[PDB]
Each structure stands twice: as structure tokens, then as C-alpha cells.
Amino acid sequence: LVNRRYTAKGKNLPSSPKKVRPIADNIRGESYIKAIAVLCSMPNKGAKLLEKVVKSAASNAMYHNKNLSEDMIFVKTVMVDDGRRRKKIWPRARGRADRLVNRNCHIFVEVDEKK
RNA sequence: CUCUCCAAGGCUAAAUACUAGAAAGCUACCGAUAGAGAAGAGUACCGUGAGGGAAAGGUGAAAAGAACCCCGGGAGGGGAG
């Protein structure tokens, strides 16, 4: 399905997919300007990560299609998958130890020329 | 009774038992949770000490390891090779 000419992919980003998915929901299908404004405004780590990926995707589309400006582009699809995990130890009382997982996420954004 | 042997001195190879190992091989033996604990090891780590004791193999036929350009602080990705 993907026009892989027009897309950006960010692998192993430092956030959990459970925390990045809602921000993706708020910009799926929006216009590029509106999405960029939302991601700049909202003060979430996932918001910043999506901002970088979305800007890169728009940049790729513009570079390969010179007659496409910032205001004919809309964020067609947005996917947020889960990535590698790292386990570190959190020690507790009575010699008990717990393992403390750190999750990463993959982010895939494709933009497309507006309707 | 008869029959056998000559102690209170000392020696003796081979047939026998064994392979940590060195050389050459065989396998209705294993093919990475298997096979030695260990394909990288008595290492990491644990205990004052004696001692206990892991996990982790695979690009391609050849690095020919991505010149260069673009987004990005990088990472990562999109082209070109």
C-alpha cells in the first residue's frame, strides 16, 4: 500500500508505545499544518518524537515531488509499533529484587497530497 | 595305616588392569535449552573461606561496510550506488 517514496520511519525511539499512541490518534488524518501545530504545542515526549518523524516524512515527500508545498500535505497514515526492551534491576526490601523494563517504539508516518 | 610335599631365605618377563593424555581413524553418536560446565569459561557473578557457577553460534559467494544528495543535534530514515 505504501508509497515508500513519501514516508518516514523512526526506529527504537525512547518512549513507550502505550504513551505515544494517543498523540498519534490526535493527528491522524489532519492537515500537515494542523498536525505540526498540535505537536509543537502539546508538551509530551511522544509529541516531540512524532514531530521529528512527521517533519522528516514531509521533507522526503517535498524533495521527491518538487511541486508539493507545506499546505497540500496531510498526514495520511500513522503507525506506532513497539521496539526493543531493556531490563534493569530495582532492588527492594529484604533482599528482593525486581526487573524494571524499559520500552522503545517504532514510528511510521506517511503523508499524502490533500484531497 | 597309607598316600603326597619339604616351611620358618630372597628374586622373575609375558598373558592382566588403566589412558589424564600424543598420533591415525570409526560411528543406525550430539548439531547450539542438544553435545564436555565451557563452539567465547571455570570467565562473569555469589561466598570470609572451603566451594558453587552461568548466559551469549549463523550478513553475503566475495565488504563489494552504503561515494554523494535530502530531513535530523545525533540516532534513525528517504534517494542514489
H or E segment at A53? helix A45-64
- The answer to whether A89 and A97 are in contact (CB under 8 A) is yes
- The answer to whether A27 and A16 are in contact (CB under 8 A) is no
What resolution in Å is listed for this PDB structure?
A: 2.9
Calpha distance A67→A76 (Å, rounded): 18
Residue given cell 505515544 in the structure block: A20
> Which nucleotides of strand B lie within 7 A of protein CB?
70-72, 74-79
| Cβ-based contacts with strand B at under 7 Å | A 4-5, 7-13, 52, 55-56, 59-60, 63-64
Q: Which nucleotide in the DNA or RNA is closest to residue A2, CA to C1'?
A: B78
Return contacts of A38-42, CB within 8 angstroms, 24+ apart: none
